Amino acid sequence: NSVQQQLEALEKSSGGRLGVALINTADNSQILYRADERFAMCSTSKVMAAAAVLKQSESDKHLLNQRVEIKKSDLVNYNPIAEKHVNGTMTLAELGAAALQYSDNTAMNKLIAHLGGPDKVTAFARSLGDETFRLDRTAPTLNTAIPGDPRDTTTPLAMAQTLKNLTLGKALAETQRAQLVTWLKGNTTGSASIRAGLPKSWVVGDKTGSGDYGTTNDIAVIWPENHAPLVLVTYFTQPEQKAENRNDILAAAAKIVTHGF
Ligand SMILES: *C(=O)[C@@H](NC(=O)/C(=N\OC(C)(C)C(=O)O)c1csc(N)n1)[C@H](C)NS(=O)(=O)O
């Protein structure tokens, strides 16, 4: 059956709602499934916050090494890196690395605070031509992922387009683009998500997110060995608040849409 039929069948088996957008940069073709529907981004939103700081750094050569004080009161629900630095400092670069590669929620919050609040992350997305993205809350409440809640949402297509712009395209000056890509490639949290649906030796940069309603997300740039890059967003969410997360669904979707590549 067709790729579309395969995705529909995956969603049917899934017990939830699947959103996929793949951009094949070889020919600019797309594989879209519920790609204009809103999903809670959860921690995939951290890419936008880190990139907003990278944009600022273009015009401030001291920004990435700027010290940020980490206090006990900054710790939240999940902060494996920031907890190592309580009573000390981390640089903005180190906070970007922790936010993206470990999904440290304290690090995300420091990025947001530095920028001046969630609305400034939204403004940065808008500056990239993304009319869809919105950040409304800090971590961890940005991961509540309540069905139909527009807060902290985007669509798979909007996020795939913006991720392509960020990592391979026109959003950031070169040094900054390269830094974002280095961060994403070194992600530690994505083994069982998109990466698990791909050949083991393909190079991937990604950012995961998991929240309530079993909301299980991953956004990736994928470099095949003999082909142009693919940009892939896989979002998944479920009807019940305490549903288990389902990274296996994301891996399955990735395998479906990258077949033949
Ligand atoms: C981002 O998506 C972020 N999610 C959370 O902080 C929530 N749970 O995360 C962990 C991994 C601890 C979990 O047990 O699911 C969460 C659930 S409900 C709520 N308000 N927050 C995590 C840290 N990012 S990820 O990339 O590791 O998924």
Curated annotation (Swiss-Prot):
Pfam families cross-referenced by the UniProt entry: Beta-lactamase2 (PF13354)
UniProt keyword terms in alphabetical order: Antibiotic resistance, Hydrolase, Plasmid, Signal
EC number: 3.5.2.6
Amino-acid positions noted as binding substrate in the UniProt annotation, renumbered to this chain: 207-209
Record GO terms (molecular function): beta-lactamase activity
A Gene Ontology BP annotation from the UniProt entry: beta-lactam antibiotic catabolic process
Additional facts recorded: The class A beta-lactamase family has a specific amino-acid numbering system, sometimes called Ambler or ABL numbering and often misspelt as Amber. A multiple sequence alignment was used to derive a consensus sequence and then the consensus was numbered taking into account insertions and deletions. This allows use of identical numbers, e.g. for active site residues, despite differences in protein length. UniProt always uses natural numbering of residues, hence there appear to be differences in numbering between this entry and some papers.
Recorded family membership: Belongs to the class-A beta-lactamase family.
NCBIfam families, per the entry: bla_class_A, blaCTX-M
Purpose of the protein: Has strong cefotaxime-hydrolyzing activity.
UniProt name for this protein: Beta-lactamase Toho-1
Organism: Escherichia coli
